[PDB]
Amino acid sequence: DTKEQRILRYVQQNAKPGDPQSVLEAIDTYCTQKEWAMNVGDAKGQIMDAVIREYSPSLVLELGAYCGYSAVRMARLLQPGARLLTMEINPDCAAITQQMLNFAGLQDKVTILNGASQDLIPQLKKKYDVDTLDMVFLDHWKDRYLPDTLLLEKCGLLRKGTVLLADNVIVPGTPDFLAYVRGSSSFECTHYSSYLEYMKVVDGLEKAIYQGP
Ligand SMILES: Nc1ncnc2c1ncn2[C@@H]1O[C@H](CSCC[C@H](N)C(=O)O)[C@@H](O)[C@H]1O
Ligand SMILES: COCc1ccccc1-c1cc(O)c2[nH]cnc(=O)c2c1
Ligand SMILES: [Cl-]
Ligand SMILES: [K+]
Ligand SMILES: [K+]
Ligand SMILES: [Mg+2]
């Protein structure tokens, strides 16, 4: 079996069905005590929680689902009728994510979109009936953060006040993305210093609020 299957089995055996907080705690335990994994984790997760509660987004797009940790984390804080769309290129991860969601009881709030973000983003309006996004969580691959931000803008998916929250802007690091949003008058940026999931390694999130074209 894979690490991802091991994480899911651990949650199923150590968490309470329908209790998102116990799912997150189980994942964080497994990944602290047994096998590191690239979930956003509790340190950065606490910052995401604070952001989600501040903005109360009706529609969130996540880029990169993996095992569903961040999806669970965000979806548990969404208001009734709010939705999360999560894009995931790896079908094995998608299948783990869907089971993680189902176990947490959040399946009604979250839709997994299977494919590359660069292929799916342009389908959001016509295929998935999206108008504009309230929040985007970028946590996929570092080299996609800037191109996908530009593509979201081109596709008309950002509106004044859309919140972009980017993981791993320090490690692995997203220097082109940071230089771009920080230098652009189309984004108002804040850096949130934290730590790499499960490790004593400085990392951080960037919040970039879209200000219109
Ligand atoms: N271009 C792309 N489109 C969609 N998903 C992608 C992608 N490039 C990488 N991915 C996916 O991005 C994920 C990064 S790890 C995501 C962790 C998750 N956000 C969490 O915090 O719990 C991986 O599962 C990987 O397969
Ligand atoms: C594949 O590298 C794993 C890794 C190794 C060392 C340090 C950081 C990471 C890391 C951490 C993350 O939160 C990540 N989140 C999303 N996509 C990632 O590729 C990613 C990578
Ligand atoms: Cl952590
Ligand atoms: K709202
Ligand atoms: K700026
Ligand atoms: Mg990450």
Swiss-Prot record:
Keyword terms: Catecholamine metabolism, Cell membrane, Cytoplasm, Lipid metabolism, Magnesium, Membrane, Metal-binding, Methyltransferase, Neurotransmitter degradation, Phosphoprotein, S-adenosyl-L-methionine, Signal-anchor, Transferase, Transmembrane, Transmembrane helix
GO terms (BP aspect): artery development; behavioral fear response; catecholamine catabolic process; catecholamine metabolic process; cellular response to cocaine; cellular response to phosphate starvation; cerebellar cortex morphogenesis; cholesterol efflux
Residues where substrate binds: K142, N168, E197
EC number(s) reported in the record: 2.1.1.6
Entry cofactors: Mg(2+)
UniProt-annotated binding residues for S-adenosyl-L-methionine: V40, E62, S70, E88, I89, G115, A116, S117, Q118, D139
Keyword Lipid metabolism: yes
MF terms (GO), sorted A to Z: catechol O-methyltransferase activity; magnesium ion binding
Reactions that this protein is recorded to catalyse: a catechol + S-adenosyl-L-methionine = a guaiacol + S-adenosyl-L-homocysteine + H(+); 2-hydroxyestrone + S-adenosyl-L-methionine = 2-hydroxy-3-methoxy-estrone + S-adenosyl-L-homocysteine + H(+); 4-hydroxyestrone + S-adenosyl-L-methionine = 4-methoxyestrone + S-adenosyl-L-homocysteine + H(+); 2-hydroxyestrone + S-adenosyl-L-methionine = 2-methoxyestrone + S-adenosyl-L-homocysteine + H(+)
Extracellular topological segments: 1-213
Sites where the protein binds Mg(2+): D139, D167, N168
Keyword Translocase: no
Gene Ontology CC annotations of this record: axon; cell body; cytosol; dendrite; dendritic spine; glutamatergic synapse; membrane; postsynapse
Top-rank taxon, per record: Eukaryota
Post-translational modification, as annotated: The N-terminus is blocked.
Entry's cofactor comment: Binds 1 Mg(2+) ion per subunit.
Family membership noted in the UniProt record: Belongs to the class I-like SAM-binding methyltransferase superfamily. Cation-dependent O-methyltransferase family.
Role summary: Catalyzes the O-methylation, and thereby the inactivation, of catecholamine neurotransmitters and catechol hormones. Also shortens the biological half-lives of certain neuroactive drugs, like L-DOPA, alpha-methyl DOPA and isoproterenol.
UniProt-recorded name of the protein: Catechol O-methyltransferase
Gene: Comt
